[PDB]
mmCIF file of C-alpha atoms and ligand atoms in Angstrom:
data_model
loop_
_atom_site.group_PDB
_atom_site.id
_atom_site.type_symbol
_atom_site.label_atom_id
_atom_site.label_comp_id
_atom_site.label_asym_id
_atom_site.label_seq_id
_atom_site.Cartn_x
_atom_site.Cartn_y
_atom_site.Cartn_z
ATOM 1 C CA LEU A 5 0.095 0.017 -0.062
ATOM 2 C CA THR A 6 2.847 2.483 0.701
ATOM 3 C CA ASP A 7 3.635 2.340 -2.928
ATOM 4 C CA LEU A 8 1.165 4.196 -3.757
ATOM 5 C CA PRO A 9 1.797 7.865 -4.459
ATOM 6 C CA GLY A 10 1.221 10.110 -1.402
ATOM 7 C CA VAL A 11 0.415 7.282 0.863
ATOM 8 C CA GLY A 12 2.787 6.760 3.762
ATOM 9 C CA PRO A 13 2.427 3.939 7.035
ATOM 10 C CA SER A 14 -0.126 6.366 8.517
ATOM 11 C CA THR A 15 -2.162 6.816 5.628
ATOM 12 C CA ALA A 16 -1.374 3.311 4.727
ATOM 13 C CA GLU A 17 -3.171 1.971 8.419
ATOM 14 C CA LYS A 18 -6.041 4.326 7.538
ATOM 15 C CA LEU A 19 -6.746 2.784 4.404
ATOM 16 C CA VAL A 20 -6.557 -0.755 5.889
ATOM 17 C CA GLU A 21 -9.025 -0.327 8.787
ATOM 18 C CA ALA A 22 -11.251 1.147 6.114
ATOM 19 C CA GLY A 23 -10.921 -2.064 3.884
ATOM 20 C CA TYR A 24 -9.073 -0.487 1.150
ATOM 21 C CA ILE A 25 -5.761 -2.982 0.973
ATOM 22 C CA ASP A 26 -6.347 -4.484 -2.588
ATOM 23 C CA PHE A 27 -4.882 -1.919 -5.284
ATOM 24 C CA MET A 28 -8.071 -2.564 -7.441
ATOM 25 C CA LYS A 29 -10.015 -1.560 -4.721
ATOM 26 C CA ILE A 30 -8.279 1.897 -4.701
ATOM 27 C CA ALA A 31 -8.081 2.165 -8.493
ATOM 28 C CA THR A 32 -11.547 1.548 -8.643
ATOM 29 C CA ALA A 33 -12.786 4.063 -5.649
ATOM 30 C CA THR A 34 -13.793 7.357 -6.034
ATOM 31 C CA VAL A 35 -12.360 10.804 -4.042
ATOM 32 C CA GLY A 36 -15.791 10.814 -2.336
ATOM 33 C CA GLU A 37 -15.401 7.042 -1.054
ATOM 34 C CA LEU A 38 -11.550 7.728 0.137
ATOM 35 C CA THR A 39 -12.322 11.064 1.997
ATOM 36 C CA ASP A 40 -15.021 9.862 3.961
ATOM 37 C CA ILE A 41 -11.557 8.344 5.566
ATOM 38 C CA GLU A 42 -10.339 10.543 8.613
ATOM 39 C CA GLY A 43 -7.011 12.015 7.162
ATOM 40 C CA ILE A 44 -7.314 11.350 3.707
ATOM 41 C CA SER A 45 -7.439 14.318 2.011
ATOM 42 C CA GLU A 46 -8.789 15.270 -1.281
ATOM 43 C CA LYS A 47 -5.653 15.433 -3.198
ATOM 44 C CA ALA A 48 -4.096 12.566 -1.209
ATOM 45 C CA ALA A 49 -6.989 10.467 -2.457
ATOM 46 C CA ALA A 50 -6.930 11.736 -5.969
ATOM 47 C CA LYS A 51 -3.129 11.078 -5.871
ATOM 48 C CA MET A 52 -3.159 7.387 -5.035
ATOM 49 C CA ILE A 53 -6.310 6.506 -7.017
ATOM 50 C CA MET A 54 -4.363 7.787 -10.133
ATOM 51 C CA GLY A 55 -1.245 5.923 -8.601
ATOM 52 C CA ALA A 56 -3.120 2.678 -8.194
ATOM 53 C CA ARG A 57 -4.458 3.256 -11.418
ATOM 54 C CA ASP A 58 -1.612 3.301 -12.804
ATOM 55 C CA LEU A 59 0.568 0.638 -11.527
ATOM 56 C CA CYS A 60 -2.272 -1.982 -12.259
ATOM 57 C CA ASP A 61 -1.831 -0.720 -15.652
ATOM 58 C CA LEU A 62 -5.674 0.663 -16.189
ATOM 59 C CA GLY A 63 -5.619 2.367 -19.331
ATOM 60 C CA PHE A 64 -5.893 2.290 -23.078
ATOM 61 C CA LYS A 65 -5.146 -1.384 -24.661
ATOM 62 C CA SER A 66 -4.825 -2.291 -28.157
ATOM 63 C CA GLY A 67 -4.465 -5.168 -30.450
ATOM 64 C CA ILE A 68 -3.129 -8.514 -28.540
ATOM 65 C CA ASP A 69 -3.312 -6.994 -25.541
ATOM 66 C CA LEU A 70 -7.201 -7.422 -25.716
ATOM 67 C CA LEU A 71 -6.896 -10.746 -26.389
ATOM 68 C CA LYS A 72 -4.648 -11.281 -23.522
ATOM 69 C CA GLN A 73 -7.298 -9.655 -20.911
ATOM 70 C CA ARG A 74 -9.998 -11.907 -22.491
ATOM 71 C CA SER A 75 -7.655 -14.797 -21.356
ATOM 72 C CA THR A 76 -7.724 -13.980 -17.607
ATOM 73 C CA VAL A 77 -11.568 -15.148 -17.616
ATOM 74 C CA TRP A 78 -11.416 -18.940 -16.458
ATOM 75 C CA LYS A 79 -14.586 -20.856 -16.555
ATOM 76 C CA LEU A 80 -16.017 -23.434 -14.214
ATOM 77 C CA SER A 81 -17.726 -26.793 -15.859
ATOM 78 C CA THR A 82 -20.999 -27.656 -15.089
ATOM 79 C CA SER A 83 -20.776 -31.035 -15.031
ATOM 80 C CA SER A 84 -22.668 -31.133 -18.872
ATOM 81 C CA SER A 85 -21.197 -31.463 -22.154
ATOM 82 C CA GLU A 86 -24.063 -29.463 -23.802
ATOM 83 C CA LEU A 87 -24.470 -26.800 -20.879
ATOM 84 C CA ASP A 88 -20.658 -26.383 -21.263
ATOM 85 C CA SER A 89 -20.562 -25.823 -24.546
ATOM 86 C CA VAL A 90 -23.377 -23.612 -25.009
ATOM 87 C CA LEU A 91 -21.619 -21.471 -22.564
ATOM 88 C CA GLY A 92 -18.936 -21.293 -24.763
ATOM 89 C CA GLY A 93 -16.670 -23.657 -22.483
ATOM 90 C CA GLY A 94 -17.833 -23.134 -19.159
ATOM 91 C CA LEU A 95 -19.345 -20.527 -16.631
ATOM 92 C CA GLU A 96 -17.480 -17.348 -16.902
ATOM 93 C CA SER A 97 -15.323 -15.644 -13.841
ATOM 94 C CA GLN A 98 -15.369 -11.784 -14.383
ATOM 95 C CA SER A 99 -19.419 -11.978 -15.071
ATOM 96 C CA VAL A 100 -22.800 -12.571 -13.689
ATOM 97 C CA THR A 101 -24.685 -15.795 -15.329
ATOM 98 C CA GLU A 102 -28.347 -16.140 -14.126
ATOM 99 C CA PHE A 103 -30.371 -19.252 -14.599
ATOM 100 C CA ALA A 104 -34.363 -18.701 -14.610
ATOM 101 C CA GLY A 105 -36.792 -21.114 -15.058
ATOM 102 C CA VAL A 106 -40.191 -23.104 -13.449
ATOM 103 C CA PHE A 107 -40.062 -24.550 -9.875
ATOM 104 C CA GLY A 108 -37.821 -27.628 -9.484
ATOM 105 C CA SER A 109 -36.058 -26.393 -12.785
ATOM 106 C CA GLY A 110 -32.846 -27.428 -11.075
ATOM 107 C CA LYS A 111 -31.675 -24.019 -10.118
ATOM 108 C CA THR A 112 -30.626 -24.783 -6.903
ATOM 109 C CA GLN A 113 -29.265 -28.155 -8.012
ATOM 110 C CA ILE A 114 -26.961 -25.975 -10.217
ATOM 111 C CA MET A 115 -25.701 -24.066 -7.571
ATOM 112 C CA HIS A 116 -25.029 -26.733 -5.189
ATOM 113 C CA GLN A 117 -23.383 -28.844 -8.121
ATOM 114 C CA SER A 118 -21.032 -25.557 -8.865
ATOM 115 C CA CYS A 119 -19.540 -25.528 -5.212
ATOM 116 C CA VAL A 120 -18.836 -29.072 -5.965
ATOM 117 C CA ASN A 121 -17.297 -28.953 -9.574
ATOM 118 C CA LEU A 122 -15.171 -26.036 -8.056
ATOM 119 C CA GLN A 123 -13.215 -28.531 -5.654
ATOM 120 C CA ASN A 124 -12.273 -30.499 -8.823
ATOM 121 C CA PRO A 125 -9.309 -28.880 -10.067
ATOM 122 C CA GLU A 126 -10.049 -30.324 -13.707
ATOM 123 C CA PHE A 127 -13.246 -28.684 -13.595
ATOM 124 C CA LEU A 128 -11.585 -24.887 -13.967
ATOM 125 C CA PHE A 129 -10.867 -24.224 -17.370
ATOM 126 C CA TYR A 130 -8.386 -21.610 -18.094
ATOM 127 C CA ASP A 131 -5.027 -20.468 -19.719
ATOM 128 C CA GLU A 132 -1.822 -20.898 -17.423
ATOM 129 C CA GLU A 133 -0.078 -17.738 -19.405
ATOM 130 C CA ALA A 134 -3.280 -15.509 -18.087
ATOM 131 C CA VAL A 135 -4.222 -17.351 -14.691
ATOM 132 C CA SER A 136 -1.779 -18.759 -12.885
ATOM 133 C CA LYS A 137 -1.844 -22.232 -10.757
ATOM 134 C CA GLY A 138 -1.660 -19.870 -7.746
ATOM 135 C CA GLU A 139 -4.651 -17.838 -8.583
ATOM 136 C CA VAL A 140 -7.129 -20.935 -8.704
ATOM 137 C CA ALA A 141 -5.594 -22.714 -5.675
ATOM 138 C CA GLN A 142 -7.405 -23.614 -2.558
ATOM 139 C CA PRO A 143 -10.385 -21.989 -4.390
ATOM 140 C CA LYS A 144 -13.701 -21.516 -1.822
ATOM 141 C CA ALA A 145 -17.488 -20.605 -2.388
ATOM 142 C CA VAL A 146 -19.801 -18.762 -1.260
ATOM 143 C CA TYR A 147 -23.546 -19.780 -1.015
ATOM 144 C CA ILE A 148 -25.888 -16.824 -0.038
ATOM 145 C CA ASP A 149 -29.086 -18.515 0.464
ATOM 146 C CA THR A 150 -32.106 -16.409 0.300
ATOM 147 C CA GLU A 151 -34.575 -18.996 0.503
ATOM 148 C CA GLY A 152 -33.210 -21.579 3.183
ATOM 149 C CA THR A 153 -32.876 -24.401 0.648
ATOM 150 C CA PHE A 154 -29.183 -25.048 1.238
ATOM 151 C CA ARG A 155 -28.768 -28.937 1.697
ATOM 152 C CA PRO A 156 -25.601 -30.109 2.992
ATOM 153 C CA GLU A 157 -26.581 -33.316 1.862
ATOM 154 C CA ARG A 158 -26.843 -32.982 -1.215
ATOM 155 C CA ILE A 159 -23.538 -31.347 -1.513
ATOM 156 C CA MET A 160 -22.017 -34.492 0.093
ATOM 157 C CA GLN A 161 -24.089 -36.672 -2.500
ATOM 158 C CA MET A 162 -23.047 -34.808 -5.384
ATOM 159 C CA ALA A 163 -19.215 -34.962 -3.965
ATOM 160 C CA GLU A 164 -19.373 -38.458 -3.715
ATOM 161 C CA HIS A 165 -20.633 -39.380 -7.345
ATOM 162 C CA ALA A 166 -17.908 -36.884 -8.510
ATOM 163 C CA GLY A 167 -14.818 -38.770 -6.731
ATOM 164 C CA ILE A 168 -14.767 -36.122 -4.345
ATOM 165 C CA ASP A 169 -15.223 -35.840 -0.546
ATOM 166 C CA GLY A 170 -18.060 -34.089 0.434
ATOM 167 C CA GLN A 171 -16.476 -32.720 4.097
ATOM 168 C CA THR A 172 -14.010 -31.373 2.044
ATOM 169 C CA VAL A 173 -16.157 -29.284 -0.202
ATOM 170 C CA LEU A 174 -18.690 -28.337 3.248
ATOM 171 C CA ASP A 175 -14.992 -27.120 4.696
ATOM 172 C CA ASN A 176 -14.774 -24.702 1.432
ATOM 173 C CA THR A 177 -18.083 -23.237 0.813
ATOM 174 C CA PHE A 178 -19.406 -20.347 2.987
ATOM 175 C CA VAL A 179 -22.847 -20.295 3.672
ATOM 176 C CA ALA A 180 -25.043 -17.160 4.625
ATOM 177 C CA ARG A 181 -28.294 -17.190 5.027
ATOM 178 C CA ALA A 182 -30.290 -13.838 4.163
ATOM 179 C CA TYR A 183 -33.623 -13.408 5.399
ATOM 180 C CA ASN A 184 -34.563 -10.505 3.390
ATOM 181 C CA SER A 185 -32.979 -8.365 0.498
ATOM 182 C CA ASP A 186 -30.769 -6.061 3.030
ATOM 183 C CA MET A 187 -29.104 -9.537 4.942
ATOM 184 C CA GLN A 188 -28.564 -10.522 0.820
ATOM 185 C CA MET A 189 -26.855 -6.949 -0.321
ATOM 186 C CA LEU A 190 -24.601 -6.817 3.015
ATOM 187 C CA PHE A 191 -23.012 -10.376 2.934
ATOM 188 C CA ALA A 192 -22.632 -9.803 -1.033
ATOM 189 C CA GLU A 193 -20.485 -6.704 0.187
ATOM 190 C CA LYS A 194 -18.790 -8.300 3.039
ATOM 191 C CA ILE A 195 -17.393 -11.191 0.698
ATOM 192 C CA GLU A 196 -14.819 -8.704 0.650
ATOM 193 C CA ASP A 197 -13.706 -9.609 3.991
ATOM 194 C CA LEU A 198 -13.558 -13.184 3.439
ATOM 195 C CA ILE A 199 -10.569 -12.561 1.196
ATOM 196 C CA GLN A 200 -9.299 -10.087 2.809
ATOM 197 C CA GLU A 201 -9.105 -12.723 5.453
ATOM 198 C CA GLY A 202 -6.990 -14.592 2.687
ATOM 199 C CA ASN A 203 -9.948 -17.060 1.349
ATOM 200 C CA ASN A 204 -9.697 -17.696 -2.429
ATOM 201 C CA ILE A 205 -13.157 -16.837 -3.298
ATOM 202 C CA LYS A 206 -13.690 -17.864 -6.583
ATOM 203 C CA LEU A 207 -17.621 -18.865 -6.750
ATOM 204 C CA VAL A 208 -20.298 -16.577 -5.680
ATOM 205 C CA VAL A 209 -23.891 -17.626 -5.421
ATOM 206 C CA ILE A 210 -27.194 -16.007 -4.930
ATOM 207 C CA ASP A 211 -30.259 -18.123 -4.448
ATOM 208 C CA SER A 212 -32.297 -16.535 -4.609
ATOM 209 C CA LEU A 213 -31.871 -13.602 -6.278
ATOM 210 C CA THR A 214 -34.818 -11.844 -6.270
ATOM 211 C CA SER A 215 -37.604 -13.785 -4.080
ATOM 212 C CA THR A 216 -36.772 -11.215 -1.467
ATOM 213 C CA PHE A 217 -37.228 -8.298 -3.139
ATOM 214 C CA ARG A 218 -40.699 -9.365 -4.768
ATOM 215 C CA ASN A 219 -41.949 -9.829 -1.168
ATOM 216 C CA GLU A 220 -40.750 -6.692 0.156
ATOM 217 C CA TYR A 221 -41.763 -4.250 -2.526
ATOM 218 C CA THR A 222 -45.099 -5.933 -3.577
ATOM 219 C CA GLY A 223 -47.457 -2.717 -4.610
ATOM 220 C CA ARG A 224 -45.556 -1.673 -7.936
ATOM 221 C CA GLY A 225 -46.320 1.787 -6.834
ATOM 222 C CA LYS A 226 -42.811 0.876 -5.341
ATOM 223 C CA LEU A 227 -41.476 -0.677 -8.032
ATOM 224 C CA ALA A 228 -39.172 2.098 -8.635
ATOM 225 C CA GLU A 229 -37.635 1.510 -5.192
ATOM 226 C CA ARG A 230 -36.952 -2.114 -5.753
ATOM 227 C CA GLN A 231 -35.609 -1.813 -8.923
ATOM 228 C CA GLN A 232 -33.149 0.959 -7.323
ATOM 229 C CA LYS A 233 -31.916 -1.561 -4.325
ATOM 230 C CA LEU A 234 -31.563 -4.474 -7.143
ATOM 231 C CA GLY A 235 -29.544 -2.433 -9.491
ATOM 232 C CA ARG A 236 -26.968 -1.554 -6.290
ATOM 233 C CA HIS A 237 -26.834 -5.097 -5.630
ATOM 234 C CA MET A 238 -26.112 -6.099 -9.405
ATOM 235 C CA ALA A 239 -23.350 -3.577 -9.885
ATOM 236 C CA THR A 240 -21.838 -4.967 -6.382
ATOM 237 C CA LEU A 241 -22.148 -8.624 -7.777
ATOM 238 C CA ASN A 242 -20.411 -7.717 -10.961
ATOM 239 C CA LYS A 243 -17.580 -5.815 -9.474
ATOM 240 C CA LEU A 244 -17.000 -8.682 -7.394
ATOM 241 C CA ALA A 245 -16.558 -10.843 -10.504
ATOM 242 C CA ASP A 246 -14.504 -8.484 -12.234
ATOM 243 C CA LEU A 247 -11.749 -7.566 -9.335
ATOM 244 C CA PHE A 248 -11.849 -11.095 -7.311
ATOM 245 C CA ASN A 249 -11.939 -12.852 -11.083
ATOM 246 C CA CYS A 250 -14.507 -15.179 -9.914
ATOM 247 C CA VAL A 251 -17.559 -16.629 -10.787
ATOM 248 C CA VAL A 252 -20.856 -15.274 -10.021
ATOM 249 C CA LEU A 253 -23.956 -17.152 -10.316
ATOM 250 C CA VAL A 254 -27.766 -16.490 -9.336
ATOM 251 C CA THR A 255 -31.182 -18.000 -9.928
ATOM 252 C CA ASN A 256 -34.505 -16.333 -10.623
ATOM 253 C CA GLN A 257 -38.163 -17.030 -10.611
ATOM 254 C CA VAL A 258 -40.450 -16.585 -13.247
ATOM 255 C CA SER A 259 -43.949 -14.785 -13.674
ATOM 256 C CA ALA A 260 -46.922 -15.921 -15.225
ATOM 257 C CA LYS A 261 -46.739 -12.718 -17.741
ATOM 258 C CA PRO A 262 -46.127 -13.596 -20.812
ATOM 259 C CA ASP A 263 -42.621 -13.036 -22.592
ATOM 260 C CA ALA A 264 -42.610 -15.026 -26.148
ATOM 261 C CA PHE A 265 -38.864 -16.110 -27.035
ATOM 262 C CA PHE A 266 -40.481 -18.882 -28.697
ATOM 263 C CA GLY A 267 -43.036 -21.486 -26.830
ATOM 264 C CA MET A 268 -42.345 -19.202 -23.609
ATOM 265 C CA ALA A 269 -45.268 -17.398 -21.774
ATOM 266 C CA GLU A 270 -43.031 -16.527 -18.767
ATOM 267 C CA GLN A 271 -40.206 -14.582 -17.940
ATOM 268 C CA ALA A 272 -37.807 -14.244 -15.366
ATOM 269 C CA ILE A 273 -38.747 -11.636 -12.453
ATOM 270 C CA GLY A 274 -36.575 -8.694 -11.560
ATOM 271 C CA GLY A 275 -37.541 -6.680 -14.293
ATOM 272 C CA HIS A 276 -35.189 -4.133 -16.633
ATOM 273 C CA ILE A 277 -32.378 -3.877 -13.999
ATOM 274 C CA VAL A 278 -32.057 -7.397 -13.780
ATOM 275 C CA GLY A 279 -31.934 -7.896 -17.345
ATOM 276 C CA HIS A 280 -29.077 -5.075 -18.330
ATOM 277 C CA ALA A 281 -26.963 -6.309 -15.424
ATOM 278 C CA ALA A 282 -26.943 -10.085 -16.082
ATOM 279 C CA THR A 283 -24.148 -10.837 -18.465
ATOM 280 C CA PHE A 284 -25.601 -14.579 -19.581
ATOM 281 C CA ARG A 285 -29.012 -15.369 -19.369
ATOM 282 C CA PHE A 286 -30.411 -18.634 -19.184
ATOM 283 C CA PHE A 287 -33.901 -20.078 -18.838
ATOM 284 C CA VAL A 288 -34.295 -23.647 -17.427
ATOM 285 C CA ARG A 289 -37.195 -26.107 -18.507
ATOM 286 C CA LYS A 290 -38.286 -29.506 -17.645
ATOM 287 C CA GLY A 291 -38.563 -32.142 -19.981
ATOM 288 C CA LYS A 292 -39.558 -36.119 -19.247
ATOM 289 C CA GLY A 293 -38.397 -37.641 -15.699
ATOM 290 C CA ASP A 294 -35.284 -35.730 -15.207
ATOM 291 C CA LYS A 295 -34.666 -34.803 -18.120
ATOM 292 C CA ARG A 296 -34.270 -30.585 -18.031
ATOM 293 C CA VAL A 297 -33.584 -28.114 -20.918
ATOM 294 C CA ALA A 298 -31.138 -25.008 -20.242
ATOM 295 C CA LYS A 299 -32.164 -22.052 -22.933
ATOM 296 C CA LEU A 300 -29.420 -19.429 -23.298
ATOM 297 C CA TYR A 301 -31.499 -16.658 -24.524
ATOM 298 C CA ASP A 302 -28.710 -14.112 -23.467
ATOM 299 C CA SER A 303 -24.997 -13.236 -23.775
ATOM 300 C CA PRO A 304 -22.543 -10.674 -25.114
ATOM 301 C CA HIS A 305 -20.959 -12.833 -27.792
ATOM 302 C CA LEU A 306 -22.566 -16.237 -27.951
ATOM 303 C CA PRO A 307 -25.780 -17.407 -30.255
ATOM 304 C CA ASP A 308 -28.888 -18.690 -28.578
ATOM 305 C CA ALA A 309 -29.014 -22.385 -27.820
ATOM 306 C CA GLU A 310 -30.600 -25.101 -25.657
ATOM 307 C CA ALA A 311 -28.633 -27.529 -24.009
ATOM 308 C CA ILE A 312 -30.150 -30.757 -22.592
ATOM 309 C CA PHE A 313 -29.014 -32.562 -19.418
ATOM 310 C CA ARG A 314 -30.309 -34.474 -16.549
ATOM 311 C CA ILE A 315 -30.765 -34.019 -12.537
ATOM 312 C CA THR A 316 -30.054 -37.269 -11.330
ATOM 313 C CA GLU A 317 -28.340 -38.424 -7.342
ATOM 314 C CA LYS A 318 -25.178 -37.297 -9.087
ATOM 315 C CA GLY A 319 -26.153 -33.924 -9.245
ATOM 316 C CA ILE A 320 -26.398 -32.744 -12.972
ATOM 317 C CA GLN A 321 -25.010 -34.996 -15.906
ATOM 318 C CA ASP A 322 -25.005 -35.474 -19.630
HETATM 319 N N1 LIG B 401 -31.025 -36.621 -4.227
HETATM 320 C C1 LIG B 401 -31.816 -36.592 -5.569
HETATM 321 N N2 LIG B 401 -31.663 -37.583 -6.463
HETATM 322 C C2 LIG B 401 -32.577 -37.263 -7.944
HETATM 323 N N3 LIG B 401 -33.353 -36.336 -8.230
HETATM 324 C C3 LIG B 401 -33.152 -35.246 -7.047
HETATM 325 C C4 LIG B 401 -32.500 -35.081 -5.885
HETATM 326 N N4 LIG B 401 -32.560 -34.034 -5.335
HETATM 327 C C5 LIG B 401 -33.332 -32.823 -5.932
HETATM 328 N N5 LIG B 401 -33.533 -34.047 -7.214
HETATM 329 C C6 LIG B 401 -34.224 -33.429 -7.964
HETATM 330 O O1 LIG B 401 -33.925 -31.705 -8.065
HETATM 331 C C7 LIG B 401 -35.622 -31.258 -8.281
HETATM 332 C C8 LIG B 401 -35.562 -30.016 -7.247
HETATM 333 O O2 LIG B 401 -34.175 -29.300 -7.955
HETATM 334 P P1 LIG B 401 -34.162 -27.598 -7.553
HETATM 335 O O3 LIG B 401 -32.905 -27.287 -7.852
HETATM 336 O O4 LIG B 401 -34.789 -27.609 -6.037
HETATM 337 O O5 LIG B 401 -35.061 -26.546 -8.471
HETATM 338 P P2 LIG B 401 -35.347 -25.084 -8.397
HETATM 339 O O6 LIG B 401 -35.399 -24.460 -9.419
HETATM 340 O O7 LIG B 401 -34.354 -24.695 -7.456
HETATM 341 N N6 LIG B 401 -36.859 -24.483 -7.499
HETATM 342 P P3 LIG B 401 -37.590 -23.386 -6.880
HETATM 343 O O8 LIG B 401 -36.416 -22.803 -6.579
HETATM 344 O O9 LIG B 401 -38.618 -23.694 -6.092
HETATM 345 O O10 LIG B 401 -37.696 -22.552 -8.047
HETATM 346 C C9 LIG B 401 -36.018 -32.401 -7.170
HETATM 347 O O11 LIG B 401 -37.989 -32.323 -7.430
HETATM 348 C C10 LIG B 401 -35.568 -33.375 -7.836
HETATM 349 O O12 LIG B 401 -36.242 -34.130 -9.076
HETATM 350 K K1 LIG B 402 -40.298 -25.552 -5.142
HETATM 351 K K1 LIG B 403 -37.765 -22.561 -3.777
HETATM 352 MG MG1 LIG B 404 -17.607 -8.708 -15.484
HETATM 353 MG MG1 LIG B 405 -34.504 -23.383 -5.951
#
């Protein structure tokens, strides 16, 4: 921290108390959020921000550099060949991918399966040149349970079938039971503290992303209030995925209100704010028995595609 221009041991002690130890945290901070700190002036604030941006080499990039920035994105396998394919390889770090769908479509199963696959090094796809082994060593996950449906038994079960040690997954997965939107948002914000404490958080799950907001801001005459809170939450999930190069996953519910992308009739809740904020948007449907269909309907560079898979005692497979 003292490498930053206009930063001595005192200011450095103040920056750490305020939770600003990461250079990126500072390079992407505002002179406003920094001044809220004690003896940190406006000039000293702006100087360190410029210093951090610089040290982090945050400027104009072109040519081959653009490809290298993109190479820092590692992906998490979903245990489904078709799904990973449709995903362009797997679940992307530095992005928010949402799985919306009818009850029992397996949104929760996907969140669980992921926490498990995150503990199998061969399920993290990356380019050693851009992403070092250390950066993805001892990966941990954060599961923000919004409805109370986290199931350790399922983690254990899915773990065994993967040939992994269930308890090992439970030991490297933090679970936070959120009872409302306020808790949900604060838990997400405190994920930095888990990292600050040495936890290599590489997976973040918000299940469910919207159920709380919808129950709290029922009268659509407060929809603006909801959209606002929800928008701040989403920005936090996005910045989190970027700075700590981890994958963020969220589940969403669907409403009767139509929205034809084909057969359709339903649509993920959360309105526009969720739509714009989510990097990859899926619609999971149920087929015969344990058959499921995940329909990718929005992403920045991939075409819309359906992926077929199943939910068995093993978790996700095929
Ligand atoms: N141990 C298991 N063995 C086989 N199938 C299972 C097992 N556990 C769960 N399932 C399947 O998973 C389905 C439920 O998946 P789930 O992830 O809860 O869907 P969901 O989208 O999260 N539902 P909801 O949150 O209410 O909208 C069940 O109804 C079972 O068919
Ligand atoms: K249910
Ligand atoms: K549920
Ligand atoms: Mg991103
Ligand atoms: Mg669920």
